[PDB]
Amino acid sequence: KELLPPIAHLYELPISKEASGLVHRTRQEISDLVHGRDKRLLVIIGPCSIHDPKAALEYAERLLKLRKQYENELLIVMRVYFEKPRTTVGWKGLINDPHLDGTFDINFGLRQARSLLLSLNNMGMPASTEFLDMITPQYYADLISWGAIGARTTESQVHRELASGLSCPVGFKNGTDGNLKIAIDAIGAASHSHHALSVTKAGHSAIVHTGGNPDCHVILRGGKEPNYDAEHVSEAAEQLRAAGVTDKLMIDCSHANSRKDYTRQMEVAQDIAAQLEQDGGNIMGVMVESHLVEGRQDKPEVYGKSITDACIGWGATEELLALLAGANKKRMAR
Amino acid sequence: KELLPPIAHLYELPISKEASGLVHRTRQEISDLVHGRDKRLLVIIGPCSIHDPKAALEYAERLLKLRKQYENELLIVMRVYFEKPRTTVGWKGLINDPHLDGTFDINFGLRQARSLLLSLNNMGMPASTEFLDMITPQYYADLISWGAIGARTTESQVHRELASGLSCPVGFKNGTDGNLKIAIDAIGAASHSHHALSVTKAGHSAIVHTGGNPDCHVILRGGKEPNYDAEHVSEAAEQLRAAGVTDKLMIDCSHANSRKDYTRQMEVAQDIAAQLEQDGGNIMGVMVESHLVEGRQDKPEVYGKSITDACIGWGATEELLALLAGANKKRMAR
Amino acid sequence: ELLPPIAHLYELPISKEASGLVHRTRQEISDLVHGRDKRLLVIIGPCSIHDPKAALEYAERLLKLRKQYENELLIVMRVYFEKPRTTVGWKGLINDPHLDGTFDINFGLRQARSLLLSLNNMGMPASTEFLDMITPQYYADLISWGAIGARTTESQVHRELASGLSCPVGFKNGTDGNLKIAIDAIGAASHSHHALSVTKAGHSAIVHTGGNPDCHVILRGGKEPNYDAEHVSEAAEQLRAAGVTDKLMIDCSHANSRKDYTRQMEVAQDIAAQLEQDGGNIMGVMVESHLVEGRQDKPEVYGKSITDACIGWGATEELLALLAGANKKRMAR
Amino acid sequence: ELLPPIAHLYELPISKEASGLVHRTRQEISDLVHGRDKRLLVIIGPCSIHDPKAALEYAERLLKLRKQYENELLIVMRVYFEKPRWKGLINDPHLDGTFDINFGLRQARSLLLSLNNMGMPASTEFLDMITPQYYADLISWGAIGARTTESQVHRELASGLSCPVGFKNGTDGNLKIAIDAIGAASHSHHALSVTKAGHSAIVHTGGNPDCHVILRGGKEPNYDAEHVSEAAEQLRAAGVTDKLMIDCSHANSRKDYTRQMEVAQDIAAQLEQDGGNIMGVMVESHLVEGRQDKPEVYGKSITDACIGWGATEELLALLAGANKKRMAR
Ligand SMILES: [Mn+2]
Ligand SMILES: [Mn+2]
Ligand SMILES: [Mn+2]
Ligand SMILES: [Mn+2]
C-alpha cells in the first residue's frame, strides 16, 4: 500500500474552529502550569492504550463531566495513546495495527486516529498522546494539547528535536533506569532551536528549522524504585533548579511507580494528595491509567477493558479524581 | 535551501563494482564472526569523529597496510563516525556542520560523507558508522560494512526497526547504566521483520516491510563500572545464551571502559589480549578510538587530531593492533 | 495544496463491478476498432457535465436504451468536464466545480471521480477527453473510451499519453479538415515511448508505455462537413495506405452539424443510409445530448447544457432508434 | 529514476553573470516586442543540438558577430535539443536509442550555462510541461511549436515563464491560433505543474506580457510584405502586439536550406522600404551546411539541413545593413 501523506487526512478531517480553539487554550493553560502561573493540577488520565474508538468516546463522555466539575482544581486531559511501546512482542497499537489482527493498515489506522481525536476535541475533551515516531505526528499533532516522550526515547536526539518543533507542552520521562538527568537534559535540548530533518505534510523529507519548545517538563515514573514521594520530588526539583529549567513536574501513578499493579495507583495518588495538602509546590500534574473497566485482557473480548497495561476502572477513577481535586482545592487556597 | 533526496547523491556518486564487492564480502565476513563460524577478531578502529576527509584518508592508507598485514588474525574496519552526540554543547558533526563554522549545510554534508565513504571502499578500506536517525542512512548505507546503534537510542523502537532493515551487521550497546538487557531486547526486535515508516531514495515517506537483521550483537561499553574483563564477559555471555541470541560480543576499549582516558585503551586491549591467549571464546571484536595524532583539541587547528574524544596516536595504534594480532593468532591455533 | 491521485483512490476505490464494466467495454470497443464486431459504438451525452445530479438522471435514462439496443449499438456515455474555450468562459467542472470562477481542483477531481464511479456502478460505461498529463491518473481507471482534443492531436506529449492509456482512444481530424495529423497520431500512440509523467503518488517520473493498439480516427468536419460516404471512403483509403485501422468514428455534432444542434439528426440519417447500403468503415458515432434540448449561458434550467447546444431527450430517443434500426440491417448481412 | 530539478540546480547553479545576461536579454527582447527598441532579434543556430563541442564552437563564432552587430541586430543562439518526429539530445543524449533523460537534462543545463557564461544568450522550444524548470532560468527566449500553439496546457506553461515567448501559426498556416495563444498566455492561470522538487502542484501563474507571433509558412509561404500587413491587421484587430517574427527556414524556405537567404532578402527589402512590424527572424545555421542521417561530420545537422557558416556571415551582414537604415529613419 502507498502511504498517504498528512494532507490527505487533513483534507477529509480538517480541524474545526471549536477544536482548534480548545487545543490553543488548553496548550496555553498547561503552559501556565509548567511555569507556575496557575496552581491547578494537570491530570493526564485514560486508557493505557486505545483499541476501541467507541469505548474511548463513552470514556470521554464520563471523563468530561468530571473535567467540568473539577475545572477550578484540576485540568483534566484524556490519554489517547495509540500503543504501548514494546520491550517486545504484543500488539503495536491502533495506528500500526487497527484491526487487531496483525495486518498492518497504517493508512486506516492514521485515519481512525485522526477521527477519534477530532471527535474528542469536538465534544470538549482535549487529548494527549505519546509521540513515538518522527513521521506520524504530522497526521494529528494539531489535535493534541499535551505530548509525552517515553522513557525509552527521552534520550534520543531526534525525539528531542521532534519536541522542539511541537506546539504543545511536552513531558519527558525519567529513564527506565530511574535516571532523571536524561529528562532534564531533554528539556534543555527541546527548548533550543534545531535544524532537523523531518517530513512535510505533503510526504517529502525536508529540513525544518524548529523554534524551540519553551513548555517542557519532567515526568517521574519510577525506576529501580518508585520516585513519587516528597523526598524524590524534592531532589528532582533541586536538580531541575541547578540546570536552570522549570521545577514543576508530573508524577505518573502507574507503570514503575505503581510497580505494575493497577491497584496501587490509588495509593500513589493518596501520597500525592498528602504532598499537595502539606506543600507540594513542585507538582504541576499527574498521570493515571484508567478505563471503564479495571484490569486487562489479552484479547479485546470485554468492552472498555485494556489490552495493554492494566487500568483502574471507572468507579476507582471517580474516587481518585475526587481525592485529588479536594487536596488541590486546599493548596490553591494558601 | 531545499533537501536533496538520496537519488541525487547516488547519481553523482554511484557505488563502484569494487566498493560493492568489498561491502558484500566484508558484511559476510563479519556475519561469520557474529555467529562463530570464523575466529578472526573484528576491529573497529579510527577517529572518534571525522571532521576532515584529508586526514581521514591518510589515516586509512596507513590503516590499510595493517589490515592486509593482520588479515589472518584480525578483520580490520575503519571507524567513520560523523559525530559524538553532545547534550546541547558544541559542534553537531560533519553531516550537520560540514564547514566547522556553526552553520548547517546538510546537502553539502551528506555529499561529503558519501564521497569519503566511496573513496575509502575504493582504496580497499571497509567502513563502519553509527546510524543516528531514520532519514540520513539512505544516503550512504550501501557503503557501510558494520553499523552501530548509539547507547542513547538502544531502547528506541524506531532505531530497532531501522536496524531490522539494514543489510550490514549491527551492534547495540549496553545502557548508560551498565545494563545489558536493553541491548539483548534490541537484538530481539531487530532480528524480526517490521512494518514501519521510512523514506525512500526518492525522498518520500513510505511503508517498509523489513526482512529482519540476523547479524546483530552486543557491545560492552562500561556503565558505572567498566565491563571488559573475563568475569563481565562470562556473565554477559550467559545472559545472551539464556535469551537464545548470539553469545559472541564486542568490547569497547574506549570511553567508560577506558574511564574516558585515551591513555588506557591499551590497558583494556591488554586485558582483552590475555583473555584471547587463555580462552576468550565469546569475544568477536573490539572498538578503538585512534587518529594520526594522540589527544584532542577544542578547535580544528592541528591536522589529524580529534576535536571530539581524545584518541590514541598512530604509534600507539600500531602497538595495539600488533598486540591483538599476536594474541588472536594464538586463540586461532588452539 | 494538490492531493495526489492515491488520496482520491483511497476514498473512492474502484469497485469490482466498475472494474468489470470497464474491462469488458474496452475489449468490446477494441473489437469494433479492429472489425471483429460490427455493433456501432455511440458516444452520447452532454457537451459538458455541470451538474452530477442531471448527469445521473441522464445516465439512468440512457442505460435503458443501452440495453434495448445492446445487439445493434454499444452505448457509452459522454462525460466531458469542459469545452475547451479559446476565450473567457467557465473552465469546466474539474477546474471550477462550484460554477463561480473559483478554482478548487481537489474538490473538482474528487467530484469527477465520484460521478464516474457512480456511473460505472449503475452499469453505464463512461468516456472522456484527456486534456493534460496530470489529471487522467485521478480517474482513467474508470474510463472505457477516451478522446484527445482537436487542439492537441498534433501535440507529441498528448500522443505519448495515449500510448500509455489502457482504453481505446480517438483522435480528431484538424480544424483544417486535416486527416493526416490523426493518422500520424495513431501512428505515434501505437508505439512504446519513454516519457515523463506524474505517478499515482504525485511525483514526476520516467514511464515506459507499452503502446496503445486500439486507437482510431474521428471525423469532425472542416471547413466543410465530412460525415458522408464520399468523405468516409476517402478517409479509409488513407488509413489503409498508412497501415492503420480503417474503422472510424464520426461526430454528428459540432462542425459536422454546422454548429447547429437541430442538424445532428440529419447527420445520423445520412449515417443510417450509409449503414443500410454498406458503411463497413464506420465503427462509431458521437452525439451531444441532454435531458432538455438547447443551451443556456447560466445553469438556470435543470438538465440543459451551458456549453454547446444539445439535442433533448425526445430527439435522443429518435436518433438512437434510427441507428439501431439501420445497424440491425448492416449486422444481418 | 527521474531526478528533480533541484538536483541539477545544486550541481549547476546559475552564475552571477548568466543571471545578468538572461535578465538583460529578456528585458531587451521585451523592448522589441513593445516597440522601445528597433533592433532585429535574430534567433539563429542549429536545427538541433546533438554535440555540445560543436555548439560551443558555433557559439564562439556567433558571439563575435553578436558584438559586431549589437547596434542593429540582437543575436541569440538557437539551442533546441530536438525536432518533433532520433528523439533529440535530452531524450536520447547518447544518440543510440537508450533514453537517458537524467544525463540529457544535465548535459542540457550544462551547455546552456556555459553559453550564457561566455556572453551568448540562448533560446529553445518548450515542448513539455515537466522539463522547462530544469533550465528555464538560462533561457532568454522561448518558442511553442506549431504543433502545440493550440494546446491549452502549453499556453498556461508560457503564462508562467519569465522570458518572452513566440507562438507559431499552425501547420495549417493558421494565424488565429497563435493570436488566441498570446491572449491566453498574457492572462493569469491556475494550472497544474511540477515543482523544482518533483511534485505535482497548483501554481498560480502571473501572466506573460511579452508574447508574440512567429510566421512560418502554410499552405503558402507567408513571409512577404503583403502577408505581414495581413498579420499586423489581425493582431491590432485582436488588441495584441502587432510586432512579429518571421522564420526563414522550414515552410517559408519550402524546406530548402539554400532558400533561407532568399527569405532574408525579402525581409531586408521590407526593412529598407518600411518593414515597421517585423521585430525578429529565425534562421537554421550550423558550422557546415546540409545535413546527414548519422553524425559523422562535425558541425553538420542530423535533423533539418542548415546553412553553413560562410552563408551565415552573408545572411547576417545583409540583415544588419538593412536594419541600420530602418533604425536611421
Ligand atoms: Mn501503560
Ligand atoms: Mn568517541
Ligand atoms: Mn460540444
Ligand atoms: Mn528545424
Automatic annotation (TrEMBL), chain D:
Its EC number is 2.5.1.54. It holds the Pfam family DAHP_synth_1. Pathway: Metabolic intermediate biosynthesis; chorismate biosynthesis; chorismate from D-erythrose 4-phosphate and phosphoenolpyruvate: step 1/7. GO terms for biological process: amino acid biosynthetic process; aromatic amino acid family biosynthetic process; chorismate biosynthetic process. It comes from the Bacteria. GO terms for molecular function: 3-deoxy-7-phosphoheptulonate synthase activity; identical protein binding; metal ion binding. It catalyses: D-erythrose 4-phosphate + phosphoenolpyruvate + H2O = 7-phospho-2-dehydro-3-deoxy-D-arabino-heptonate + phosphate. Residues 27-315 form the DAHP synthetase I/KDSA domain. One of its GO terms (cellular component) is cytoplasm. Phosphoenolpyruvate 1 binds at residues 78, 83, 146-147, 168, 216. Keywords: Amino-acid biosynthesis, Aromatic amino acid biosynthesis, Metal-binding, Transferase. The keyword Membrane does not apply. Belongs to the class-I DAHP synthase family. This is Phospho-2-dehydro-3-deoxyheptonate aldolase. The gene is aroG.
